[PDB]
Design an enzyme around this catalytic site. Structure first.
Site, mmCIF file in Angstrom:
data_model
loop_
_atom_site.group_PDB
_atom_site.id
_atom_site.type_symbol
_atom_site.label_atom_id
_atom_site.label_comp_id
_atom_site.label_asym_id
_atom_site.label_seq_id
_atom_site.Cartn_x
_atom_site.Cartn_y
_atom_site.Cartn_z
ATOM 1 N N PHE A 171 0.852 -1.187 0.000
ATOM 2 C CA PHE A 171 0.000 0.000 0.000
ATOM 3 C C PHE A 171 0.891 1.242 0.000
ATOM 4 O O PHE A 171 0.920 1.989 0.987
ATOM 5 C CB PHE A 171 -0.935 0.029 1.209
ATOM 6 C CG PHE A 171 -1.999 -1.035 1.199
ATOM 7 C CD1 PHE A 171 -3.197 -0.822 0.542
ATOM 8 C CD2 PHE A 171 -1.819 -2.227 1.881
ATOM 9 C CE1 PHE A 171 -4.187 -1.797 0.540
ATOM 10 C CE2 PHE A 171 -2.805 -3.202 1.895
ATOM 11 C CZ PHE A 171 -3.989 -2.989 1.220
ATOM 12 N N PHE A 174 2.563 1.456 3.928
ATOM 13 C CA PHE A 174 2.811 0.196 4.615
ATOM 14 C C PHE A 174 2.468 -0.952 3.675
ATOM 15 O O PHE A 174 1.823 -0.768 2.641
ATOM 16 C CB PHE A 174 2.009 0.092 5.922
ATOM 17 C CG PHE A 174 0.549 -0.197 5.719
ATOM 18 C CD1 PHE A 174 0.082 -1.504 5.670
ATOM 19 C CD2 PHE A 174 -0.360 0.833 5.582
ATOM 20 C CE1 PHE A 174 -1.262 -1.772 5.475
ATOM 21 C CE2 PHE A 174 -1.700 0.572 5.394
ATOM 22 C CZ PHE A 174 -2.153 -0.730 5.337
ATOM 23 N N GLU A 181 0.856 -4.990 3.798
ATOM 24 C CA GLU A 181 0.128 -5.994 4.560
ATOM 25 C C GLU A 181 0.726 -7.371 4.315
ATOM 26 O O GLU A 181 0.884 -7.789 3.165
ATOM 27 C CB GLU A 181 -1.352 -6.012 4.176
ATOM 28 C CG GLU A 181 -2.112 -7.181 4.798
ATOM 29 C CD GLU A 181 -3.536 -7.335 4.275
ATOM 30 O OE1 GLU A 181 -3.823 -6.918 3.131
ATOM 31 O OE2 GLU A 181 -4.375 -7.876 5.020
ATOM 32 N N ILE A 182 1.051 -8.078 5.391
ATOM 33 C CA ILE A 182 1.436 -9.482 5.290
ATOM 34 C C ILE A 182 0.162 -10.313 5.335
ATOM 35 O O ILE A 182 -0.561 -10.293 6.337
ATOM 36 C CB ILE A 182 2.398 -9.888 6.414
ATOM 37 C CG1 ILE A 182 3.615 -8.956 6.453
ATOM 38 C CG2 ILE A 182 2.821 -11.321 6.218
ATOM 39 C CD1 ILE A 182 4.414 -8.946 5.166
ATOM 40 N N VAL A 183 -0.116 -11.038 4.253
ATOM 41 C CA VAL A 183 -1.368 -11.779 4.116
ATOM 42 C C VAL A 183 -1.193 -13.240 4.519
ATOM 43 O O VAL A 183 -1.880 -13.724 5.424
ATOM 44 C CB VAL A 183 -1.917 -11.679 2.680
ATOM 45 C CG1 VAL A 183 -3.276 -12.358 2.588
ATOM 46 C CG2 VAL A 183 -2.008 -10.229 2.236
ATOM 47 N N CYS A 220 1.843 -16.363 5.235
ATOM 48 C CA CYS A 220 3.204 -16.879 5.344
ATOM 49 C C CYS A 220 3.115 -18.378 5.566
ATOM 50 O O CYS A 220 2.439 -18.818 6.498
ATOM 51 C CB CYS A 220 3.983 -16.253 6.507
ATOM 52 S SG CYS A 220 4.076 -14.476 6.522
ATOM 53 N N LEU A 253 2.269 -4.540 8.449
ATOM 54 C CA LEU A 253 1.128 -4.803 9.310
ATOM 55 C C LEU A 253 0.556 -6.170 8.962
ATOM 56 O O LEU A 253 0.560 -6.573 7.795
ATOM 57 C CB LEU A 253 0.045 -3.712 9.166
ATOM 58 C CG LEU A 253 0.333 -2.336 9.778
ATOM 59 C CD1 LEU A 253 -0.758 -1.346 9.400
ATOM 60 C CD2 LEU A 253 0.467 -2.418 11.300
ATOM 61 N N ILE A 260 -6.909 -3.190 5.253
ATOM 62 C CA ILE A 260 -6.683 -4.568 5.657
ATOM 63 C C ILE A 260 -7.867 -4.993 6.513
ATOM 64 O O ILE A 260 -8.484 -4.176 7.204
ATOM 65 C CB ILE A 260 -5.346 -4.749 6.411
ATOM 66 C CG1 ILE A 260 -5.323 -3.936 7.701
ATOM 67 C CG2 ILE A 260 -4.192 -4.303 5.543
ATOM 68 C CD1 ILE A 260 -4.040 -4.111 8.490
ATOM 69 N N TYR A 307 -9.979 -9.249 11.208
ATOM 70 C CA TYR A 307 -10.703 -10.457 11.569
ATOM 71 C C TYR A 307 -10.845 -10.552 13.079
ATOM 72 O O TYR A 307 -9.861 -10.430 13.814
ATOM 73 C CB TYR A 307 -9.988 -11.688 11.022
ATOM 74 C CG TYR A 307 -10.029 -11.778 9.522
ATOM 75 C CD1 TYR A 307 -11.181 -12.194 8.866
ATOM 76 C CD2 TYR A 307 -8.919 -11.442 8.757
ATOM 77 C CE1 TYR A 307 -11.226 -12.276 7.490
ATOM 78 C CE2 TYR A 307 -8.952 -11.524 7.380
ATOM 79 C CZ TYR A 307 -10.107 -11.939 6.752
ATOM 80 O OH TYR A 307 -10.146 -12.009 5.385
#
Ligand SMILES: CC(C)(COP(=O)(O)OP(=O)(O)OC[C@H]1O[C@@H](n2cnc3c(N)ncnc32)[C@H](O)[C@@H]1OP(=O)(O)O)[C@@H](O)C(=O)NCCC(=O)NCCSC(=O)CCC(=O)O
Ligand SMILES: CC(C)(COP(=O)(O)OP(=O)(O)OC[C@H]1O[C@@H](n2cnc3c(N)ncnc32)[C@H](O)[C@@H]1OP(=O)(O)O)[C@@H](O)C(=O)NCCC(=O)NCCSC(=O)CCC(=O)O
Ligand SMILES: CC(C)(COP(=O)(O)OP(=O)(O)OC[C@H]1O[C@@H](n2cnc3c(N)ncnc32)[C@H](O)[C@@H]1OP(=O)(O)O)[C@@H](O)C(=O)NCCC(=O)NCCSC(=O)CCC(=O)O
Ligand SMILES: CC(C)(COP(=O)(O)OP(=O)(O)OC[C@H]1O[C@@H](n2cnc3c(N)ncnc32)[C@H](O)[C@@H]1OP(=O)(O)O)[C@@H](O)C(=O)NCCC(=O)NCCSC(=O)CCC(=O)O
Ligand SMILES: CC(C)(COP(=O)(O)OP(=O)(O)OC[C@H]1O[C@@H](n2cnc3c(N)ncnc32)[C@H](O)[C@@H]1OP(=O)(O)O)[C@@H](O)C(=O)NCCC(=O)NCCSC(=O)CCC(=O)O
Ligand SMILES: CC(C)(COP(=O)(O)OP(=O)(O)OC[C@H]1O[C@@H](n2cnc3c(N)ncnc32)[C@H](O)[C@@H]1OP(=O)(O)O)[C@@H](O)C(=O)NCCC(=O)NCCSC(=O)CCC(=O)O
Ligand SMILES: CC(C)(COP(=O)(O)OP(=O)(O)OC[C@H]1O[C@@H](n2cnc3c(N)ncnc32)[C@H](O)[C@@H]1OP(=O)(O)O)[C@@H](O)C(=O)NCCC(=O)NCCSC(=O)CCC(=O)O
Ligand SMILES: CC(C)(COP(=O)(O)OP(=O)(O)OC[C@H]1O[C@@H](n2cnc3c(N)ncnc32)[C@H](O)[C@@H]1OP(=O)(O)O)[C@@H](O)C(=O)NCCC(=O)NCCSC(=O)CCC(=O)O
Ligand SMILES: CC(C)(COP(=O)(O)OP(=O)(O)OC[C@H]1O[C@@H](n2cnc3c(N)ncnc32)[C@H](O)[C@@H]1OP(=O)(O)O)[C@@H](O)C(=O)NCCC(=O)NCCSC(=O)CCC(=O)O
Lengths: 160, 156, 161, 161, 161, 160, 161, 160, 161
Positions: A66, A71, A73-75, A77, A109, A140, A143
């Site tokens: 983004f 920043f 986003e780590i979606v 891993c 993030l 993001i 959840y």
């Protein structure tokens, strides 16, 4: 032979790599819908750092830059089960950090579940969020029950 | 809403359908490696008849047409677990037959495990192979089974 | 450092010199194959060669010709240079060649072996029992009267490398 | 049926296989010269090779590099295959190379001759007296220390072929 | 002064008159073959003819059709003009055709030989044993019922010319 | 005026209407064959039809499929319109078909004959003795249980 | 499953085979219309056909000819296959044809009906009272000696389907 | 050798054919001005169906298509004197009818003089005019004393 | 026969008439907004409408404005024609709009609801509890006095249609 590539939907090599990444993510995160993982892996605004061992995908990090919001986003891993506890997940995050320094994005993030918090802490993430809420909320997905975690990168040090 | 589509690797929707097919094939046939299912499903010479319910892949038949040899190889057949015993596999094979009538290929060849021969027998497949071994050895990649089609029946 | 590459002459300088080195190793290890016949096949566009590279330098290879319409691949030349033999390189070469052909949906190898090379092929899973019909290979593969025709069937559920 | 052709990798298939044949003849007749070094020079665009073709087939040649800004040519490899030696082919090869260089106005050859071929170069008019200034070649030609540097001056007024 | 050239109607005037001369030699030496049939095949783009030229003039040739997808070549017409026969021209014609087919990787000839020329084909290595599968040529070559089908296998390792 | 033409789907307007006229004559003369099956075959580019034209209009034809890799041709449909039968037209159609195939180096016809027309094929030189090996025709020709496989051998001819 | 499609001959095999099916159904249901005449009109590019498709197969249709310069459309052939008649399909076809013409602003149908067809057209709103003048249709529509000219006027402010 | 061509002013072959047609029309209709015949024969909106015998013009029909008005005007019909009473004038009109069916013009109009009425009657023309006056008046010239005659074509029958 | 289409004015005749039908439905179902204002927004290029088509006819829609830079979409107008209400169409519209925005990586809806619409939005999962910070939406959406800001959070893992 170990290799790292940043790939994404814009070549059959990359396509089959994206399928392998979708398979690894889905198998390692089975209570996440398979088509959701597939949709994100093949979304053009999403990228995946692919870990290739002997031409085959053994892990990766799906992320979302983004630059307008400053920043990434780590979606997702994941590393395949028989290759875990070997340092691959750390090398993946190090390469991802170096990649982001060269693109001048210095904040990660992620919304982490309880099984992943330990991994993120050992990669330097913490629950102290410096990025203001107005910069990430809605971009993001928050959840319920997930833990927001942040990593700040130092562009003066070599991560790889 | 149920729809059938013959798709393959030459569009985001078809692409995701091909991933969904590779998922269903891999999960229901756990013994074939996932990467090889993936390369077969995305191989341009291979086609897949996809069973779509409400925009989602729930089954399919991956197949390889050999018009020079006079037959089609059935590679993968699968219906997702929660949709089985509903007649979807029968409708899938019927549409595959109708498709091949329209292209005048009138023989199916496939290797069936003992777990699935009864389904293939109910689709008219038989273990009596009329195609000569000199014709299919090396083209079709268990029990070898053959289905002969009649280009006068409307299968769908 | 060990390397493997599928290369061939396309209707690049490194590939050209690698093909010259492969012609050289094939020629020295197969003294009864005329040099020009090796060179003509190695540089033929429909032939490929799996090159085995050590320190940027060819020390072995397998030259082969794929027949996708007929469902098999012909093994044309196999060689490892002398001071690198009996170290497993020829088996790794064959393993890589098998993996390559799974990825290209070809599961049959055909080759002709004289009495000195049969043992090598037998240890790589080749057999004198030929399942491919003669109407499928005669006139497409190079025929060698007095040599033994050998066949290898591959299993595409298996990783060879 | 004998033909002479100046060729090099700037190639169609005939020239490519001719260059392979030349690398084979050079390498077999110069067995302590590394094959890969011979290959790189034969296939280097700045190097040319005068090919001796008999019945469509390479039987000898001279690999050379022209230095027109320096006014000389470096002779790199000279070889005739074994069963064609002592027939005058080497002399006709050198004569054709001399004629070629007259028409390109390069009138000096330089080469390193070892103990096995110095008598051949002497019979082609080469001498140990180097008239070319040392400053003109010391940074350009490969120095084969241990061999003897020799020079041949060409007369652009006589026909060599 | 003898020359060999593979030609066909894909033609400049020299090739056109060469093809006419070939049709004349074939028709005169095969007098019960209809002239118009010979003409259509000689001028068919899918057919080639190896022309034997002596002093700028056609004195013989071999008309043939390559079937590379089938892996063989059909020999259609072979003739040498009357006053040049029994001199080895027919043998040199066949040798040049063999060499041509090695370099195109077609290693099988098929032809129908009648009672007047079967001995010539036998001396060029043709045999009544047909190794090519019957299914591979039955729909492609013209069946000259009454004549004998013969086959020649080529060795791509020997020089024929 | 009588015309013979070997045509097929590629076409132009003349050929298209002739193909429709052929599909009509085949369909009317073989009324238990499905009309759309006859249409799909007549318009399939791998099938050809020899058309018998009288005054610009189809009165008969023979639809066939050549198999040069196998050395034979399959005869699919043969028909002459009702008011033109028993005049020699079917013999001339088969004669022209033979001539065409002799020129194209196909010396074998295979066909399935039923009880209503096997006598016509017999008079054209067909017999129940099948010399074409079973390994050559299975899977290429449409196999019909209840009809009799028939074969015709052509004599080769040097043209002109 | 029922579909309606307006098609015509302008690469598409599906449309081609549908047009053949429409020609078959028109021909079988109108035995006094010559088959070649039906074919010539169905495949005429200024003619269109509204096709009634059930399970991918033609079971009926209306072939028509739009005359936009003249302000009407000519009804050329109407048919439903025998086993599908008396189910409303002929009414649905004509309704879809009316809706298609509302959106193209053609509000008059003309047709020639024999005594056996007049009843169907009357139930579709056609009348023997012709408001379109003779100078507008004669020589544009094909006339039929002894059949009854019928006219239908459409209301563009009404939904027909 | 007999041949039919539809030609007109838009090639030297066609030009000399148009001159031959003008010669035949003028010679057979001598009380019509020669330049009027020439002007119509070479008018681009006029066409002539030419009857060629041994490369030479022996007859023809000059006509004028009015597709907007839904009819064709027959202007000149002539066959050279030594070729009359042989069926050529009938074959010419038959070919012209077939040509017009394929162009979907099914009405012929002509103003016939007393010497031509018998020929037109035997080609199916009559004095009963169905085409309304408003469709032809002024488009074709009503010569005083000439007889208007009409032929309606049946597009379901073959005229040639 | 129901269909859903996301459309907007950037051209098509079909789309243009649909947009008019949408402007008509929005204006009739919301009569106290100026119809000029509805028309301007419906035809504004930054605005899109999800159109509900029944039998080719517009019967409802949702006009919306995507703000991808701000990470939310504004819901502008929702309406279903009177004869088609209380049949689930409004719910299906919003479901399709949710699925559409999930596939475009937008996870928040915002809308200013009048008192008559609050119940509808509550049933679609909208809330008065606004998690989006004011700095993200103030000024991009118009805060009409007396209207109630409502928010819907979307879940990318949920299949909404
Ligand atoms: C988490 C990873 C990616 C880590 O891969 P690796 O095993 O290669 O890690 P590594 O580089 O070898 O180093 C691991 C070091 O971290 C420490 N550690 C503490 N907790 C750990 C944990 N869950 N997983 C791995 N390591 C962990 C280990 O003790 C070890 O200590 P040392 O320092 O001494 O070496 C893998 O285990 C995996 O794929 N797990 C399953 C999928 C997964 O949970 N992915 C993360 C969630 S991704 C997602 O979107 C789910 C939703 C969510 O994140 O909430
Ligand atoms: C086998 C299928 C595809 C069949 O699909 P469905 O379950 O929808 O079948 P259906 O149409 O609902 O019902 C058809 C009838 O088959 C009969 N029947 C007998 N044995 C059966 C068997 N193992 N599986 C399913 N049906 C079977 C049932 O009685 C059934 O009802 P009636 O009696 O009333 O008629 C599916 O169940 C499935 O995905 N199974 C797991 C994957 C699999 O086994 N694939 C086959 C090998 S795949 C291949 O082609 C080769 C790959 C390889 O093995 O290498
Ligand atoms: C054959 C190769 C390529 C194999 O090279 P390597 O020595 O590296 O093989 P390796 O993996 O190290 O050893 C494999 C094992 O096979 C067993 N073995 C038995 N007989 C053998 C034989 N002739 N050659 C190689 N291995 C052999 C050995 O015991 C060995 O150990 P274990 O038993 O303990 O496992 C080489 O030796 C070579 O270059 N030979 C000369 C060239 C040649 O002959 N090429 C093949 C024909 S050329 C062709 O392809 C056909 C063309 C034609 O001729 O028509
Ligand atoms: C040297 C050549 C190229 C010469 O070929 P030919 O035999 O055809 O020469 P020729 O014309 O027939 O003979 C001409 C005369 O040379 C004389 N003579 C004297 N010494 C000779 C010698 N070593 N080799 C060949 N000829 C020699 C012959 O007796 C003859 O004498 P008369 O006329 O009086 O009867 C050949 O012998 C050869 O291929 N040798 C092996 C390869 C080689 O050594 N090349 C040169 C190395 S130098 C090189 O290229 C590598 C680079 C480097 O090392 O620096
Ligand atoms: C057959 C050829 C083309 C051969 O020409 P040459 O005379 O130059 O052959 P050559 O090289 O000089 O001789 C080689 C050897 O063949 C031997 N020999 C045996 N029978 C022979 C025969 N009928 N004709 C010529 N040579 C024959 C010679 O004795 C000689 O034996 P030694 O070496 O031991 O001393 C010629 O004779 C010719 O033009 N004949 C008439 C045309 C013809 O028949 N063509 C082939 C028909 S087949 C055809 O093309 C038509 C197609 C068809 O019919 O199917
Ligand atoms: C069969 C044909 C095409 C034959 O056409 P013609 O009538 O013009 O034949 P012809 O040349 O005039 O007569 C040649 C000789 O055939 C003999 N003969 C014997 N049985 C006959 C039979 N059923 N029909 C016609 N002729 C027949 C005649 O007596 C005559 O004998 P002489 O020598 O004494 O004069 C036609 O009758 C027809 O269209 N029939 C309906 C369609 C049909 O049945 N087609 C074949 C389906 S067979 C099938 O199962 C599929 C294979 C396929 O259709 O291709
Ligand atoms: C005429 C059609 C197309 C009508 O088809 P359908 O049977 O599907 O009509 P339907 O909607 O199901 O029935 C509508 C109602 O009309 C009434 N009705 C009146 N006449 C009818 C007639 N011939 N056929 C069927 N129904 C008819 C019935 O009572 C029926 O029930 P209710 O009243 O109780 O509701 C068909 O019957 C047919 O294909 N006939 C053969 C071909 C044909 O005649 N074509 C028309 C001429 S072709 C043309 O266009 C002119 C060309 C020319 O000849 O010059
Ligand atoms: C009229 C034609 C064109 C007819 O040519 P052909 O002789 O080839 O006709 P045909 O095909 O052989 O057939 C002639 C049949 O029609 C019958 N018949 C009755 N009156 C006839 C008449 N004037 N001319 C020719 N045939 C006539 C014949 O008995 C004969 O009977 P069967 O049925 O038993 O065979 C020719 O005669 C001619 O060129 N005449 C001079 C020019 C001319 O008058 N052209 C028409 C006017 S053109 C014009 O613009 C002038 C103004 C105007 O038309 O009023
Ligand atoms: C509101 C809609 C679009 C809803 O369409 P439908 O009738 O098709 O909805 P539905 O899915 O069939 O019914 C869903 C349920 O909503 C519940 N419900 C509770 N309060 C409701 C309320 N005010 N309006 C409509 N439905 C309401 C009903 O009980 C209904 O039954 P169950 O719960 O039992 O299932 C329509 O009624 C309409 O067009 N109204 C006029 C225009 C309008 O008011 N639009 C609202 C957005 S106003 C706007 O466009 C801009 C201004 C603004 O943002 O407010």
């Amino acid at each position: 032979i170990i290799e790292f590539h940043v790939i994404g939907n814009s070549n059959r090599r990359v396509l089959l790599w994206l399928v392998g990444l979708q398979n690894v993510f889905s198998h390692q995160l089975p209570r996440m819908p398979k088509e959701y993982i597939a949709r994100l892996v093949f979304d053009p605004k999403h990228k995946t750092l692919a870990l290739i061992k002997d031409g085959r995908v053994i892990g990766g990090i799906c992320f979302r830059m983004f630059p307008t919001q400053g920043f990434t986003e780590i979606v997702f891993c994941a590393v395949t089960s028989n290759e875990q506890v070997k340092g691959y997940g750390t090398h993946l995050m190090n390469h991802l950090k170096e990649y982001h320094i060269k693109h001048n994005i210095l904040y990660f993030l992620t919304y982490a579940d309880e099984y992943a918090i330990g991994y993120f802490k050992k990669q330097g993430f913490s629950k102290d969020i410096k990025v203001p809420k107005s910069r990430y909320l809605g971009y993001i997905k928050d959840y319920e029950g997930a833990t927001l975690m942040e990593c700040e990168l130092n562009p003066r040090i070599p991560y790889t």
